[PDB]
Design a protein around this nucleic acid. Structure first.
Lengths: 228, 219, 219, 228, 228, 219
DNA sequence: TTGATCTGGTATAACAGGTATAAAGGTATATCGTT
DNA sequence: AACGATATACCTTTATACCTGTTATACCAGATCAA
């Protein structure tokens, strides 16, 4: 450890991991694979090989580096996706106990209402083409299977991408994944009429956005979320 | 892929299914490894990940246990997230903007189902909120209590958790606080809350949203 | 040429010769490379090709295994092929025309060797086929069951595979289905199947082929 | 990746390959070598050189580009030949187990009967010259070795080319290759008389086609396939 | 070229290739990739990049180096296989004109008779186990297809490997390849009885070798080559 | 793999099929490349390989032609092969041993079909062979003429080519020749050839093979 | 003598192979607990 | 006090990524031939 300090009983792995943390915080490395390999650091610190592996693995969990296969660690910063990855541990309890299912629906409804209100209020002359091509590519009836579902979720994503906030897209993807993960026994009984109703509601929504009237858009969105 | 994450999620869902309660009820990890056809460092990495999460307790050579409280992981995630500040100077305001997208989803709900049982509660809350006198201690406590009783109107435990999380996040983020400017800030805040509760009584969510937007713009 | 394809076909024929069963029975790929005088990226490309095909399983650092089921490559090829639609508008009908070249090779075979043991089977099949009532669920199932029991007359496993492949291909190709027109469609279909089985009993393959051509032209 | 996302443990090669797939599907490239070289894309994505090589190689297998030697990738569409190339993996089992040999023969017989019926029914006044010159160039007895075999397979090919379906010629070539690949110990014992019988049967077939009588043609074809 | 000599009209590629030849003959390099890459030599000689590529390519043809993929040239010596590779250009004429087919058969017969005579005369007490295990693994009747053919050619190879001459194995492999390349329409009509006759003849050959009587072995080999 | 070798073998088989005779009958290589979907350096490498082989002739900017004589490639291969001498000191004797495996396949053939028409030819050959007097000039010429008339007994053009190739190879390999020892060498050679022709007349291939082995062992 | 075409050489780009590094899994050893 | 089980650490193997080298293709320049 370049300082002659064993620290065996007090877990010497903490010493090397905090030394690596300090060396990274000292702005002595770049943003990629500037850090050496495992054997180089092992020989430089006169320690074991599995210790450095555990250190890096713990560091990745803490959200500091990233490794894939046959490449050194790439130092980065913990973004919004890292927080969502570290979370979701208690999400199973919410779907386990009877409640919470309506709470997630209410949260999603509030989020979508807020974002559609912001989009209708800050409606520029360029984002109209995005929603136009979205409703155009989601207008034809060619595949009544899962293609319409992915088209609808892509339309929702491009609608949520209007503000331009990295945390917004992250939480949107997280909520959509947590919602589609709790859809058991999906059957194709009345999904075609559901697709037609969704198309009509999207047409009404874009018409209300063009006319600058969030009331009708909010009513159509509430009706769509109540019809499920 | 990586075996580690597989057995990690397996033991996570096992401890979530309430298969083992308090104490050292887990079997020997050697025969677990022999049955799962995994490696020794994988189990050590899984235990280290669980220790970093804050669910098990390993000191010397004893076995792991369960952890019912969840306050350690909260401050852990707080310290881990409150770091991305020097990268984006104004992007933090985006996070503040997120708070907007939350509060605007609250003042427009009082006119939905609140009839009289919540009106008395918010009135008796704002009574003490206005009776408060201290600028740094009483006014901040009154403001957070008003925000809590506002978030508790729909009756949702997730909303309260999100609100307190945003509160502690902004508290850890903002490093400098004022006293003279905060006085007029909370003054205008409760002056606008008066109009907010007036519009709530009159069943007009537009005026409440406008007052909230003006309060957020006043900073 | 490319060394990769050579060792790929070599390991393919080796795993087809049943040299190694289930599990990690393959030796170390390092000495394999040393004996074959090949390169490191070639082995990685071969393993990636085998993973894309759906015969091996590599997640992290373990060894490859064998894969007995073949349902993943089926849907993989389905998704990979069901794409050339916007290039040729009517050329897809050519594929449908191919189906003709298959069905015309079936109705002309019942008069070859089927005497009575298949007649009872097709009769008890068409019984339930006509007893079906639902337009979108029962009629389509009855039609595919009749097509299956027709293709199973010569007793050929390849014919059944080709038939089910054409079925799933046309299902993935056609994006819009009807209910009112499909009713009369299957009505005329079984009305022509009546004449088809009559001609089969009378040992006349010409009338069956004419009825099949008329059914295909009716769309 | 122009988005600051490591994705090391989750195989970053999938990220770049799906990015390339999306860029190709966005109709931002032509149909040839419009895509840049390996070093250009490597420097643009700030990734490794072997990663882009593996991506392109995987893409070629999926059936999207094509490379030869010293030339950029040519984007195209997976035709019928690509499906046959991706298949044929289970064809060895059929020739391994005792059955299947008669099944392939029955399939080929059904295909040839259907195509000859279509040719006799849609017989125009122009395709007659093709079969005429075919039987003329396959009439003289100059080389009794493998020249007659290739003449016969060329006659079969030009007969199968009458409908004009790209998938038809593809499956015909595939079946002929899979059939000639399973002809062990080909000896020249009675191949001359076989050539004479084949010539007489082709004469009978073209006569039945001229007379518009598929029955005699089908009988002659059945006799030829039974005589082998 | 380190000497200030253009030699443009007289093909300067000859100058650099003869300089490389002299540098190699000066015993200044080892036996592997000791020579630098293409860019290093290009910058050292102040010439073009394709010129060095053509030089190395010509050198490989001359039989001096060897390249595969992503590796420097490995200097070696032209062995017997290089001569066979450079030859075989006029072998197509022999199979084109009617003669020569019996000439190759006579040459192969002379070669096999000479090698079997040498093996029977220099029969030691160790090579008997090789032929014993060969005839043992070629005795069972498990696959009457091409497995017996490859077993027979492996037996012929291990029989030709008795003297221990690198040129002998090279010319043996060359002759066997040139002979199997001229086997058109191989059919499985009487190959099983041919396999039984070959097994009996190999038994007679090994018995004559044990008894030290090359006459019976030569007669059996002549009968086998006449039966084809 | 390498495109170069493909088009090289293609043009080789094309010029072997006698598609183009003498002169510049080949078309423009630009449209050849456009039709073959190859590169420019590949055609240059193929032309360089053909020039090194000795089939085409390119000096400045003209087109390639055909080459009927094959004497240049002979000496080219001779110079290219006569180099591996310092590696294996005694392995060159293996090559000499190969010559054995050739000559032993000749003396045992005279008793097969030669009746009298070849006996007179070999007799009138050995007449002048013995009439020769010079040690370095006449005896070597007599020996090579006797070897030629021996190899020409079965009537095979390939055998003569192989014999002359071995002759020029051994001539280029052996750098030192003697005169006094070569005298007794050829003396014993023809003294053994006397017994060889005697055994050929008596129809006894064993004695001829023994005499040939003794001559080869005498060196 | 000038212009055009063809051939050859050089340079650049792309693909493939090999090597190195990192991560995961398995095995062994040590420590703690229970009988 | 001894034995067994569990946990942690270390080592080895496999996979992935990056870099380097080689080959092929394209472009430019020079030379030769024809008008």
């Amino acid at each position: 450890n370049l300082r002659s300090r064993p620290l065996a009983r007090k877990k010497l792995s903490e010493m090397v991991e905090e030394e690596l943390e300090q060396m990274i915080r000292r702005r002595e490395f770049g943003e990629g694979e500037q850090l050496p390999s495992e054997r180089e650091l092992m020989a430089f610190f006169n320690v074991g090989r599995p210790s450095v592996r555990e250190a890096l693995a713990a560091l990745k969990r803490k959200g500091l580096v990233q490794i894939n296969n046959g490449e050194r660690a790439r130092v980065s910063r913990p973004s919004a996706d890292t927080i969502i990855g570290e979370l979701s541990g208690m999400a199973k309890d919410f779907l386990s106990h009877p409640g919470g299912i309506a709470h997630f629906e209410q949260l999603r409804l509030f989020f979508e209402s807020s974002l559609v209100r912001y989009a209708a209020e800050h409606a520029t002359d360029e984002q109209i083409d995005l929603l136009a091509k979205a409703l155009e590519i989601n207008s034809q009836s060619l595949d009544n299977n899962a293609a319409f579902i992915r088209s609808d979720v892509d339309f929702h994503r491009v609608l949520a991408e209007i503000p331009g906030n990295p945390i917004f897209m992250a939480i949107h993807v997280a909520l959509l994944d947590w919602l589609i993960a709790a859809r058991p026994t999906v059957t194709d009984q009345a999904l075609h009429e559901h697709n037609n109703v969704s198309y009509q509601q999207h047409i009404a929504i874009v018409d209300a956005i063009r006319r600058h009237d969030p009331d009708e858009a909010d009513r159509a969105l509430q009706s769509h979320l109540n019809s499920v």
